[PDB]
Structures are given as structure tokens and as C-alpha cells.
Amino acid sequence: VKLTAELIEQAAQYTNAVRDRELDLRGYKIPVIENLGATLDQFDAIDFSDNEIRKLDGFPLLRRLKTLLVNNNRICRIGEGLDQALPCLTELILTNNSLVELGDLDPLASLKSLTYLSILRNPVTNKKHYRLYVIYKVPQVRVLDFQKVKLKERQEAEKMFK
Amino acid sequence: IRPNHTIYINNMNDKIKKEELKRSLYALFSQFGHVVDIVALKTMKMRGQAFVIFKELGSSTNALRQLQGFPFYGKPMRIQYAKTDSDIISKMRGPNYILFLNNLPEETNEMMLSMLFNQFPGFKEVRLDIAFVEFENDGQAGAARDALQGFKITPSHAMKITYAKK
Amino acid sequence: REEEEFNTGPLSVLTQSVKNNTQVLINCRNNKKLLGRVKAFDRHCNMVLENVKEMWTEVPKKPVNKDRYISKMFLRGDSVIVVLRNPLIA
Amino acid sequence: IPNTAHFANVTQIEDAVSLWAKLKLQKASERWQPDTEEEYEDSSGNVVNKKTYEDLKRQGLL
Amino acid sequence: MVQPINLIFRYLQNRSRIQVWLYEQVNMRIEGCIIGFDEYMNLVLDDAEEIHSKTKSRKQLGRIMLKGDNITLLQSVSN
Amino acid sequence: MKLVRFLMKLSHETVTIELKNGTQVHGTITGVDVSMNTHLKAVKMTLKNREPVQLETLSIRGNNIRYFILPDSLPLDTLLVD
Amino acid sequence: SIGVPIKVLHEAEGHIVTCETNTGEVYRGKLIEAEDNMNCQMSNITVTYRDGRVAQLEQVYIRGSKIRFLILPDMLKNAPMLK
Amino acid sequence: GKSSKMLQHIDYRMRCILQDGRIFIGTFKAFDKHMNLILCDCDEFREKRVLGLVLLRGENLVSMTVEGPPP
Amino acid sequence: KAHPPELKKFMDKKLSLKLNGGRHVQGILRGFDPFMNLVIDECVEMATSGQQNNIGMVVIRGNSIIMLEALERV
RNA sequence: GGAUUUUUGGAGCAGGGAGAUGGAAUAGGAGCUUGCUCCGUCCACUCCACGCAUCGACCUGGUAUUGCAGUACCUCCAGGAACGGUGC
Secondary structure, rough: OOOOOOHOOOOOOEEEOOEEEEEOOOOOOOOOOOHHOOOOOOOOEEEOOOOOOEEEEEOOOOOOOOOOOOOOOOOEEEEEHHHHOOOOOOOOEOOOOOOOHHHHOOOHHHHOOOEEEEOOOOOOOOOOOOOHHHHHHOOOEEOOOOOOOOOOHHHHHHHHHO | OOOOOOOOEEEEOOOOOOHHHHHHHHHHOOOOOOOEEEEEOOOOOOOOOEEEEEEHHHHHHHHHHOOOOOEEOOOOEEEEEEHHHHHOOOOOHHHOOOOEOOOOOOOOOHHHHHHHOOOOOOEEEEEEOOEEEEOOHHHHHHHHHHHOOOOOOOOOOEEEEEOOOO | OHHHHHHHOOHHHHHHHHHHOEEEEEEEOOOOOOEEEEEEEOOOOOOEEEEEEEEEOOOOOOOOOEEEEEEEEEEEOOOEEEEEOOOOOO | OOOOOHOOOOHHHHHHHHHHHHHHHHHHHHHOOOOOOEEEEEOOOOOOOOOOOOOOOHHHHO | OOHHHHHHHHHHHHHHHHEEEEOOOOEEEEEEOOOOOOOOOEEEEEEEEEOOOOEEEEEOOOOOEOOOOOOOEEOOOOO | HHHHHHHHOOEEEEEEEEEOOOOOOEEEEEEEOOOOOOEEEEEEEEEOOOOOOOEEEEEEOOOOEEEEEOOOOOOOOOOOOO | OOHHHHHHHHOOOOEEEEEEOOOOOEEEEEEEEEEOOOOOEEEEEEEEEOOOOEEEEOEEHHHHHOOEEEEEEEOOOOOOOOO | OOOOOOOOOOOOOEEEEEEEOOOEEEOOHHHHHHHOOEEEEEEOOOEEEEEEEEEEOHEEEEEEEEOOOOO | OOOOOOOOOOOOOEEEEEEEEEEEEEEEEEEEOOOOOOEEEEEEEEEEOOEEEEEEEEEEOOOOOOEEOOOOOO
């Protein structure tokens, strides 16, 4: 059950709780996120929860994409061309994923508009100084794992590994 | 308190904005299921509290059980069931196959037993301190037997559900 | 009633532009002056003209003036501010 | 809704659906439904509880 | 209930000096004696004067036919 | 006499419309109403100090249109006869 | 003679709505009187403008001449507004 | 003649541009002779502003175009 | 057509009217009109510095009327 | 069916002054390149008149509320002022 144009044209699309145009693509078990050109950047949020996506890549240019729900998936790697395809990506929910190393968070630093990031329920969050490395690598993010970044955490991230 | 599709979380940080807290609650509730509505106020009566109403009651129950006492913006929020039904849900609404129930309350009618069995999909019939519930599907009957084993309904007594014999 | 008021009032000054085929100037609210021959008019001053020359002045945002020419155009009577008839075709 | 002699000279939609509800209620009422209409007395106490339906008896004998 | 047309007729019969403020123009107003009116609020001021509040000057014009689409507020003065 | 009947008979023609805010929209005129509601298909709009954008459909009101631009090969003498 | 947005605005009288004017003034409150010419008369109204000067007044009246837009709740967008 | 220019875009998401430079993207449900647009669950872009059901007057409308497929 | 505005409840009440160009006046209404023209007897206009100037009975047209707020409970 | 609430528009235009202040990589003219001098287009800082006052959104610290609802917005104190509009 791969993501095609007929699956995106038959999927439900409505208004979310934040008054944004969201398309519900849950319950599809798509192994790879592709063929997203049929939406023509008419959705403000993408609900791709409960899927089997392994890599968050292969997305076309969508300037209206501001929220991406990748919860309950097996995402273990992030694409390096995420900034060239989503310049206005501000919300990224990557809870309960397959990220084990902090080096997968290195392509996530290119998103300058990203402010809300969720990396909870992951083996990469259980490593030593994971939050300090995420604050040092991504200074544009203001809320990490439902927690506001303070000045002391930014000073601790800028002190170590400088 | 009976389980419902709306789960109310309280004891949260009231210093954040309303839209940011609503977006954080929606991003927290999207991992357990589709969030239909999010009611969040910042007045003197509803300070530091919000609620999320979902489509399915099982996703709301899983979000209330998993995020019970989770730290939200520095303060551990307490999640519980809603007292009344939501307006959006009221607007949108309007192993073996046989399972043996023991220690059931006699004051409960057939409508309460149907609402308790409605977490599982459509069954064949219901029989009425002992009761017999037979489902049309074997996996649905197994999920209903695994879910109702020690359920929180009429807390003066404890309800026990077991599989029927031949 | 309407024809006598159009041929005896200010609209006759428009009616002398289409009958004798004379050139008149129209200054609009966008600081532009278009000189041309009026071909079609109406009661709401809807002027459809041919062979018009529109001149104005623009700043770089010293400034400078500019001009252009159009083969056939049509302008509504709302944006028409000033209409001047002068013997410029001879 | 099936085409029968009951739905003759009826030309409107809502009239048809209401008469179908009526006929459904009538026929479903007048049948013999053993599942809900039956009196079993299970051998749990064997001298009491004759209010058992046809489904609770299987649940008790399972 | 006092009608505005009846008040305008009483002001024209009394021949008192009234000041008219323009629409979207607070720097310059007019002042004069309204002689007659019409259905489109067209005022005919005799020996009218344009008063500029920024420059504190007054320029007389005489008989002026002011349209009702530009006059926003009209007040009665003792002068 | 009436310019609305002349504007309504100018369908299937590639024209341009300049608004009061400086935005010029060039496209094929497909629908004209009595209130000068210009409905065009496959138009290109250029605003003041902005980049031109191509749209599959556009609907401009009559009160927002300041000037129009017709091609030189338009039969204005034949279309004026009511 | 009566429009469908005019009928939707007249049917939404008595609910907590808002009216944003052309100058940016947002009069919010219960729509007590709504005429056919977009005349909105509200009681216990609140002024939240684009200037931001938020205040509370006993009664307000905004005409349809300088009215830019109106924000209404979504309780009347289902029925009988479905055409 | 047919007057099907506004009926073909009924129950669809359209983005209308205002005179001051604002853009309202909403589902057009009904209209009138004064071009009164009723945009249910509309978004305001110029930043994103949560508005919802916005009833904008026809005097502040400039242009309107199709945004996407109907929900 | 030509329905008059509902100004019967605001009769003989002290209200504040806003006019175009940022003008503010306060006074008691003495009548109504179908063209939204209001007669304010003993009206006081607010200046730019903040001082109130009494202009007496004035007439405000409907073409520049922005918002009228009733200062008295009706 | 161009005369006050919708469609023949009341819209257009310009951002205070000074200083031997600083820059036009590839884009000004003249004294007929380059170097220099003069004059009608910005941004950054400084000074006078942080252009002024207002309220809303917002950041730091301290502090109060533990409350079951369908919402313009919601505790208070102090500092800073990146944003919006109102009148001069």
C-alpha cells in the first residue's frame, strides 16, 4: 500500500484543532512517503501517523507545509534536502521513531523555521547529553519534547562541544 | 467516572499562551489517535486546564493511561475522564466467541452493558450477578475479554470476564 | 429626454469627440494623461478609445517622466477625473 | 425497499420509507424469534433463575 | 424626534452662520450662511469662507455650492 | 449605448486589465456579467513591485478594474452594432 | 430581496460574534440587532481594534458602510445553510 | 446569460485578496448580488490567523481564485 | 426597501459617535433619519490635545459615521 | 438601475533636521577612464524632539489560582522594548 496520487485524492481532508487544513493519511501503512505532488501544497498540516515510513525524505517543494506528524513510525534517518522542500516547516512530531544516534539530527539543523520538535520515546533521547546536543545543533527550535528552552540550557549547550 | 471520548488534563502551566498550549496538546494527542477537538480556556475558572476530544474512545483511554502524570511544560499534568459529553461528539453522533461475566451489578440495565461492550465492534446478543456476552468475531471477543478483565465500572464491586467453555 | 440631455449637456462634449473624430485628453486619478480619439461612450462615461498615448511621471522609489502608446483601450468612468477637449488633431 | 403490492400507488419517497418502517415493525413483531423469546432455566442453581435467555444459558454452560 | 431635514430648514430660515467640515480632511473647513438646500444635501453658502486650522487663515470666496457628499459634520456658530 | 453588452460580447479574447492598485492581469476573457464580473482562465497577474504569478482561473470585480487593454485586431466597429 | 449571507447574518443574532470594521475596529459580543443593510447593534459589547484599544461598552452600533468583515461561529454553517 | 460563473465555484476552497493586501482562504458556500462571500474555516495570510467562519463584505473584495480541491 | 435604522431605543440617550479622519463627538440624539443622519443636541467634540469643545446641536451624516457607542444603559 | 450602507471609487503623494560619519562588488553625470571634487535615490549608529502618548500581542525573574468547558483577550509586580494600528 504505497502512497500514490489515487490514495491522496481519496484521503479525507478537513480543518484541524488549530484551524489549519490537515489531511488524515493515517491507517495506510505507507513504506515510503512519495507522490505528494497531487496535493499541490493545499494542506497546512500532514497527518502521517501510524505508518511504516523508514526515511523522512522524497517530498516535493511545498511552501504551505508547516506541520508534519510522523508519530508511531519507524523513521531512523532524515533527508538532507528537507530545507529545500519545506522552507516553512515549523512543527515536526517525530515521537516513537527508530532514531538511535544523534547524527540523524544533523540534517534537521537546516530547517531554520523549525521551532517545535518532538523526539520523545526514542533511543536517541536516552543517550548522554542528547538534549544539549539537540539545543546546540538546532538553535532555532524553541520547544523540544514539550519543554521550553531556557537560557541556562543554551549556555550549557554552547559551553560543551564548542 | 465512565470513560468517554473527551479526556481532560489539568494541573498544567498557565503561563504559556493558549494557542501554543493547544498546539502542544494536539501534537501530544496525535500520537495516540485522531484529535477531533481541543477545548482550552485561560479564564479564572478554567485556568491551567484543557481537554482533547477524539473520534474513538479507545484512543482517548490510551492517551489518558499513557500520559497519566506526564511532565508538560515543567508541570506534571493529570489526565482524567470528562464528566459530561462533548458538544462536537454529540453533534456528530446525532479463546471463544462467548464470554462469561461474573460479579455484575444488578442495578445496571442492558443499555449500560451495551455501552460497555461498544468498545468492541458489533456483537450477536447479550444475556443477563452473572452475564453472558457473545460476539460475532473471535478476535473482537478476545479483545473484549482481555480489556474487561478488571475494568473500572461500578467501583463498589469488581467485574470479571472470562472465556466460555464447551 | 435622454438623447437631448446627452446632446445638450456635458456629454455633448463627449459627442463632439466621436462625431467629428477629434482628439481629447483624459487625466486619471493615477496621475496619468491619455490623449486619444473617443470611439465609444456611454451614460456612465465608459470610454472605449483607439490610438491613445498615455504620459505620466515616476520616481525610482531625481524622478523622471515617461510615456507610452496603446492601439485600442477601454477605461471606466470611475477613474476618469478630468476630460479636456482641445483642437489638437489639426 | 422491495417492490411489493404494499408499495403501490405510493409515489413519494418519505411516504415509502415511513410505510417501510411500519411494515418492518409489524412483520418483525409478528414472527417467532427464539433468541429473545424463550425461557431457559440453567442448572447453575437448577431450582431457580428461569429468567435466563437463550444466550445467557450458553454463557453459563460454557 | 427632530429630523435633520427640518433642522436644516430651520437653519436656512434663521440664516445663521454654520461651519461645515469636509470628509477625510480635518485641516480645512468651510463657514457660511446656508440659503437653500436640496435632496442631495447641496448647500448654497453666501459670502462663504474657507478656514484652515493648520495655517490659521481664512479665505473668502463668496457664493459657494457645496455638495453633500463631502460635508461630514455641520455645526452652528455664533459668528 | 450600453457598454455592458459590448463587454459581454468580447469573450474568448486575450485581453489585459489594470486595477487601481497597479496590479495588471492578462488573460483570456471567458465570462462577463451585467456587473462587469470578469471571469478569466489561465491568467497572469503582476502586482506592484512583485513577481508575476500564473493562475488557472481568476475572478475580478467590475469596481476594482481601472483600465482595460484590447488587441489591435479586435473588430470594435462590428461589435458596436447592437 | 433578501440575500443568503444576509439571512445567515440575521439567523446568527444572539450569539457571540465579532465585526471587524474597515478602520480595523473589532466590535465583539452578542448580536442583538442585525438588519438587512449589515447594521450590527450589540449590547455589552467589547472593542478590540487593530489599534488594540480593548475596552468594554454597554451598547455599540456599527453600520454596514465601514464594516469590512464579520467573524461568526460555525454553529449555523451545517443546517439550513447547506445548499 | 447563464450566470454560472459563481455557481461553478460553490462549495470549494477559494482565496480572495482584499484591498489592503490581506488574503482570506476559505470555503465559499453562498453569495448574493453584493458579492457577499461566506468563507467557512478560512485562514488569513498577509503570518497565519485563525478566523474560522468569516463573512467578508463585497466592497473590500478585489480578486478571487481557486485554491485547491473541495474537502 | 429603504428601511430606517433601529434607533428607537437610543433616543434621548447620551452616546459617543466616531467620524472619519479620527473625529470623536459625544451628545444626546434628538431624532433619526433613513439616510443615517443623526442630530446631536449640546454635542461636545474631542480635540487632538484632549480638550472637549462644545459645538451645540450638530448634524452628522451617514457617509462618515464609523461607530456609535451608547454611554447609557438602555 | 453613476447622489450617504456594497458595482462607475475621497483617491493620490511624501516620510523631521544636522554632523571633516560609512558603502553602490557588476550600474550615475560633469570637470571627456583610473585618483580626486560636486550634486536631485537607502540602510547602521550618534545628537536634537530614543518622533511623541495610548492599548493589544510578546521575553525574563518572583508570585497567586488545582478549578469539568465550549471562548475577541485573561492573576499581579518590575525591567526591556523586536511587532500592530490610532491622533498630532
